[PDB]
């Protein structure tokens, strides 16, 4: 397709700033565009999910997401590239999440909430243009039923749009359009008496019905895409990105201070488990040693202090001679820091790469405790962290659903007041600790002048 | 919940003319002071008004339902004065409308309607304790008009034909209803066929 | 970006005047070349590079890499076989060694070549030059590690002065990057 | 199409080559598929077999011999297995890597396929034309003969950037020769040119603004000069994989964008590499990869060895029905090479299965023009030599078609069509540039 | 091949019933698995699908003009077809044979019963080639696609069930699924496998899968490219990793075999690895000092 024809089709599609994603995007995009747009939309959806799991109000979620919109997925722009980004990201995520039923449910829920937010941020004229772009009633029919419709919708207006004055409510109602549809499609709104009923037809709260239709259509299209996926399995190029995206949903620091309580309060439970295993056994197996070493490098421990740390931890029991440590372990610890071989500076393991680990056996301390520990044992340490029974129950409920990172964020929040990286947990804890220390110092200074 | 849903407001307007004639005169349940305290007072919103009405009715026993209904307004007017009187008047009117609905609005059995698998007694069945026939109901129906099975037997002894008994009008009414239902079913089948083409 | 280009090879320039060869690491410190306020300058003979003398070498390196990629070398996954060949069996992934179960793969994969072209592009990304995220062309133990380190403000001003040259050099790579 | 290479798709193309040639052989020799069997397994009946010539070892010496070849079978024929060849019973043959062949042989002991005879792939049918079209071409030429000039790069020497010889040639064609069509092959600005390669590009005093990219160098160095070609001479531009102006460095190679070269629409046409096209009735087959230099034969027998190499190579090109039949592609060690995009080897086959009347494959070898299997094969040589001395270009003059003169052969059938006889009607001159 | 048996039985049954007969995947998790891994046989997937959903030539209404169109399984009102009836007959006869085997005392009759049961199982599992094979006398693309889609569904819900039991699907296809039990003891692994079998049978009444191989350790690269310590008495078993033994001297093969023995032993993965390092350094010293028999250096 000529670039010009492609632009024409895309403009015919965007006549409104909002879309049902009915027709497949046509055109070619590069792999960098593919992956970057997919990851950006995925970040937006993950932030939506994290806000929802914390029972945040709709206004708070909107306020949190607006800067993320301006940064990752610009909406309400006239640029063709941003609209292309939204459409292609949506269809890439359709390809990603069609594999399993639970993924489908999470995707449709998050996408419907995103639809709701975007519709809420639109202007009333744009909303009218979008809904016009499901039969609207004539002005005569609205005039005949005006009293009943206004009586039905006055409470919804007051509570949803904060139109406290009656004059404003009437003025809005005069401009509001109504849709006539059978009450069986809007039984949910019928139950709460939010829609007017006449002769078996419900007069429309429109956002809720639009979201319901969008979710239903999205579910059906995900099912069709799942049926057509094995034909796409022949593309060696997209499969790794799709697999990664689908699984993505799931001298202050030296060798001595890393053991201190001041630094020890900040690690996540995985790191505490690895360090406890190292202290008890004076040895960590390969995966645990790698996880711990990469964390320690990521938190500021230099290479020489890392070698000192590992040698001191390993030789404490006398079972390991310094000669054996230098013969077998020194090379690997230097390699982790990019000082050996191809000098590759290995990045610290995020949560996802840790979970991609092969499951800890007997004698293993690596992995994620929230996935790899029994419920009783997790309850034991969460009690040791002075968490209440309700907080422990919430964390265990998050763990049961497979949202281990959500539970990690939860324990962070309860112990300190979305995290997907051990170094991120450490950094946030350190920043909070420094802020608290500065506040305490300011309070001490203020109390000394009276 | 306020404002009323149009169904609720329409039902209130339909029930308002009957509230006086039934409750305040024919049944007169609040003539008894204890019954008044138990059922009429708890529908009010203001504790001071409730206490004042309770004291007034204790000092003046056995006022009829209409008299108590007027006393509610009189004492509320005596109590609620100033710029805030309008809100009190509106709330009292709302409480009175809520009591009208509480007393006259349909009170359905909620279980039988919920599920498709629920069983309900077939029409024309005999009630084991009264012997009344579960006859269909028209606008003129009253419980005393339901024929009894023993009376139907007595009629059949004189005339051995169902068409000559008191059960016949109800049978005719049901037959007409069934005929109309069948005609509408044929119309719906035709409409479905037209929609499919 | 740090891990994206770990295996790419450096862009080697030849001085038109004195024939000295040196890698081009963008606007960074180097013993062999200097980017001046008025263009790229070889430090051995002080002579200046004009766009054509740079862009022709950039295009020559890109096309040499593309020709090598289309040479179609295959390598065997199996670490005990490891043969490198250009023969392609009608079953592509099958190794041509008798009984070998390794998976043949194009030695110069399109992912590697796309990474190389992206490294070339990042060399003349002005914004990437300013924040200093280019991959180093020298290890610390290299004998040619540069004796003087350029400052941040010098890098900013110099990149601003040389914007046209960097944009033209970037367009030369983008000529093939849009086709890849 | 982008720069992607997929092993499965390339293997699909390589399999399809063998399958199509199997079907062609069965049709030509009227043989049933039951007659064809798998040559990699032991059978004690003589069988028919089709496959690809490959070295018996994947890591092979640069020089092959008649005792070190194998036959690669298709997926259906032999599950992709490769069998060594026993050619002790064949005295005369000529093979090359990537050639698709048909054998009548016998694999007796499991480790060797003994070829008893060769099954030469038939030569493709020649194009034909109706009487009406030939009369229209007769009217087009106005009696006079058809003149077409073909030139090939490089156009300027290795130690300078002078196109004075090109200007001389343009003036000659404009005012004396006056051809109908002029076909120019690449490379125009060769990227393996040592001055371009080493960055030794000087300031040009005759340009008001110096070029900043090789594309601007073309626009300022060639396009003025090419614009002086007379508008009555339609000219055809065919790239090479070494053309700097091309952003498609793979064979088959997409045609240049004429607008990007700023060449006017009036007489400038850009054609793909390879390209097949008609000039009047004449069918042209043009490919810009040096098959003649690259195809290296294994040979037995005095008869074939006594033959000219060029006729053998041209017959190989005709039989394989593809302009660049060698595989794997040749390489220049890394500097340049064939740059075959194996996934699209379909596009380099003869268009429609017709053998072009005149096939032009420029070569670094000496210029030649020869008639092989009733096809005129032309190598016009390089326009200018490395040292700057005169190169060569080829002039093709074809007698105007005439149904009455008898040189056109009528093809029997209900619908009368006529075989073009270009080898009877074309005179080809190799003129020093 | 299986083609003769499948087509022949089908044509026999069809001619007998008054019918006119026609004229003549989850990618492996490469690496070392310390926990016990069980190979769970899924050969009866297709016959159980055909039997459960009453898929047959006479029950599935299909568009015979466009063979690529996917049909729908017949409703439960449709009587059992000839094909599912034959499959049910085979399964019932196999159950009868096993019931007889449980009581039988004579070794001769017991072996005969086992052979009968094996033949019945082979036919039941080969019955799909009737309608799946492209060159089959009874080929039917819509029915093959229906059965294949149902098998895909069943395999994915099998993954979900395994994850519900905190199990990891190491590798899987229509024929076998390998599960990481997460245990290091034979009894625990077998109990986990039997529990998984019970769950799969609970969700699919006609699908009876069983344990085919017990892997104490598993260094996996592909379905048929792996090494493992199989339990029957643990024994080293390698598949697809002994392709090129000729090119390596006996010393190299001895080193390789010893390393495999040590890494897959029941010792802790650090003391065994230090044993490997001691062995390797000792080998280096003997090679540098040339104290090894020259026979071990020979290469043919
Ligand atoms: S959620 Fe991530 S950071 Fe937290 S304990 Fe688990 S692996 Fe560690």
Author numbering:
A (entry chain B): 42 to 174, 180 to 250, 254 to 299, 317 to 483, 496 to 528
B (entry chain A): 206 to 402
C (entry chain 1): 1273 to 1452
D (entry chain C): 248 to 580, 606 to 705
E (entry chain 1): 792 to 815, 848 to 1055, 1063 to 1130
What is the paper's account of this structure, in its own sentences?
The eukaryotic polymerase α (Pol α) synthesizes an RNA-DNA hybrid primer of 20–30 nucleotides. Pol α is composed of Pol1, Pol12, Primase 1 (Pri1), and Pri2. Pol1 and Pri1 contain the DNA polymerase and RNA primase activities, respectively.
We found the apo complex existed in two major conformations and determined their structures to 3.7 Å and 3.8 Å resolution and refer to them here as Apo state conformers I and II, respectively. Due to the small interface with the hinge, Pri1 is partially mobile and fluctuates between two states that are 28.4 Å apart: in apo conformer I, the Pri1-NTD contacts the N-term of Pol1-core, and in apo conformer II, Pri1-NTD connects to the Pol1-core palm instead. This indicates to us a “transient” nature of the interaction. 1 Pol α fluctuates between apo conformers I and II in the absence of a DNA template, with the Pol1-core catalytic site being blocked by the Pol1-CTD/Pol12 platform and Pri2-CTD and Pri1 moving about. The active site distance is about 70 Å in the apo state.
